[PDB]
Amino acid sequence: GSSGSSGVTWQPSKEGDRLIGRVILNKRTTMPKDSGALLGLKVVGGKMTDLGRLGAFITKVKKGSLADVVGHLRAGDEVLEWNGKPLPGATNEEVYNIILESKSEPQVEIIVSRPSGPSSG
């Protein structure tokens, strides 16, 4: 089992206009509820993107979950890569399998893209 640094890191994208969020979790058990290898959030793949291609996005995030305390993610973030797999470019049927396959992985790396510039007020 590979044990690497965990948490969450936010950095500017290739262009610098976006913010690539790098999150990683280390679990040794499949969620109790009917999640399906979900660190603690519902992901919808096979979705459409403003770019014209497919991509996955978070619709909900459990409170107190790894993807909520260690990842600090939110609903709407476009999941770029899930455990080293390109979510975008595939259907919801292919994206689900990729995320579910991690159900047996002692470590998962979630990489989402956020619009550089959080709302303050």
Q: Method of determination? A: NMR
Residue 88 DSSP label: T
Q: How far apart are the first and last CA of the chain?
A: 44
- Per the structure block, which two tokens stand in for 41? 């959030």
CATH of the domain at 80: 2.30.42.10
Gap between the Cα atoms of 113 and 121, Å rounded: 22
- Per the structure block, which two tokens stand in for 70? 């260690």
Gap between the Cα atoms of 1 and 105, Å rounded: 9
Gap between the Cα atoms of 24 and 66, Å rounded: 9
Which residues, 6 or more positions from 52, have their beta carbon under 8 angstroms from its beta carbon? none
Q: What is the CA radius of gyration of the chain?
A: 14
Which residues, 6 or more positions from 1, have their beta carbon under 8 angstroms from its beta carbon? 106, 107
Give the C-alpha distances (Å, rounded to integers) separating 7 from 15, 22, 49, 56, 93: 24, 8, 27, 21, 28
The total of structural domains in the chain comes to: 1
- 60 - beta bridge partners? 42
Which residues, 6 or more positions from 102, have their beta carbon under 8 angstroms from its beta carbon? 37, 82, 83, 108
Q: Residue 12's domain spans which residues? A: 1-121
